[model samples]
Target: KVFGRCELAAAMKRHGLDNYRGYSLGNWVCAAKFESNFNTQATNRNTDGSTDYGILQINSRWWCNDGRTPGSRNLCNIPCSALLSSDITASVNCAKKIVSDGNGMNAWVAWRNRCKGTDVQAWIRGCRL
Candidate 1:
């Protein structure tokens, strides 16, 4: 599923990502904007020999296991394929765990490089929250 800017914002809010862990809905939307451009089937392999999966680009190194990563922890206990599903339920759940597990939004470099410390309000601008 490829979501538009406001569309993704609404979806994230529905999944309880709004104000999660002190991060606003804009924060989540902004992160996804840069991470995978709201494409649910997005995937990227990391330099550390791990792969990121889904819209949020959740990593296989510590989150989901693809059975291809060398020593993944599978902390989210979900298969990597679940993250690629059109229904973002599994992806959102794993994302919540990533933020709650002490990393906060720092789990994704995309968030740090673009979303963090920025006026993220533009991410969900014009979207009714």
Candidate 2:
């Protein structure tokens, strides 16, 4: 994700992803930070045999397509590969749908464990727009 801090925020803002689906933009940023360190190509395997994808680290167990992922409920109806792109349009769209379904940022363990209730204004710090 060539996006560093303010760059990420700027991109998110430009995409109108900030505060979508009732989750704070800061939470989203934090999730991206801890989940993938803002690397769009990141993928991780879990002990449960699921894969986490992209900067958002969307899971294969439920929120993404299975195929090679195996046993994925694919609730998000998108291929795991889609989230791995620098263009976050598909990833953000799926994230919005996930949050709209009431998962919020808590759906992400990164946010639940690392970002919860923490001061997050710094996630968007110094981004002028």
Candidate 3:
């Protein structure tokens, strides 16, 4: 399902992402915009034979298994389908853990490529923050 930008921002705030991972909320929201556009069902294939899943575009190689995506590490202990659901709490938790693992938002290529070194205030503007 797709979420409106404001809708997703409010939900993200409710999920405690405003200060999660000690990074700016705008970065996460910006990455979400470029990565999956707030759609939970988004997926993209990578060149390394892995698939990105859900709103965060989490990789199958390190995060979760699609059952058919053999040899996944499942480090986050979730099924790839779990990320595709409308509910995003699990996904948020996994994202927090991923950032906590020390990669920061650099783990998301979209963040590094597009959001980094760019003004990302649009991701949070007019949210009354």
Candidate 4:
């Protein structure tokens, strides 16, 4: 399921993204816009043979255990398929774990390129949330 802008923002906030690791909800919303276009089922294969899953594009190499990526750590300790769910709670939780590793929002290049140091308020402007 593809989430509407405000819908995604609200869902993320409900799952504890607001002010998480000092990154505002806008930072997350902005990253999701670029990562998977808020689509729950998105997946992208990496050059290293790892696949990024779900809206936040959690990587299989270090985060989720896809059982296919070489030397996967599964720090999130979930099946990679779990991140593909429309519920988004698992995906958001995995994202929080990534941020807690001191990468901040730098874990995603899309966030670095599009959201970091930008006026991200517009990403959730007029959402009425």
Specify the highest-lDDT model's number. Answer: 3
Ranking by TM-score: 4, 1, 3, 2
The digit string of per-residue lDDT tens for model 3 on 23-122 reads 9776767887887887888888888768888878887887787765678778888788888887777677888778888877768888898888888877
Q: Pick the candidate with the highest TM-score.
A: 4
The positional error of residue 29 in candidate 1, measured at the CA in angstroms, is 0.7
**Model 4 TM-score, 2 decimals:** 0.92
What digit string (tens of lDDT, one per residue) describes model 1 on residues 1-129? 878766666766678876888877667677766777778787888887688877778777887778888777777877888778877765677777777878787778887887668988776677676
Q: How do all models score by TM-score?
A: 0.91, 0.86, 0.90, 0.92
Q: Which pairs of residues collide in model 1?
A: none
Residue 57 lDDT in candidate 2 = 72
Clash count, predicted structure 2: 0
User: How many clashes show up per model?
Assistant: 0, 0, 0, 0
Q: Is candidate 1 or 3 superior in lDDT?
A: 3
lDDT (Cα, tens digit) per residue for candidate 4, span 1-129: 967868767866778778877977666678878988878898898887788887777778888887988788877777788778756666667677777788777778887887778888888788876
Candidate 1's displacement at residue 111, Å, is 1.4
Residue 51 lDDT in candidate 4: 86
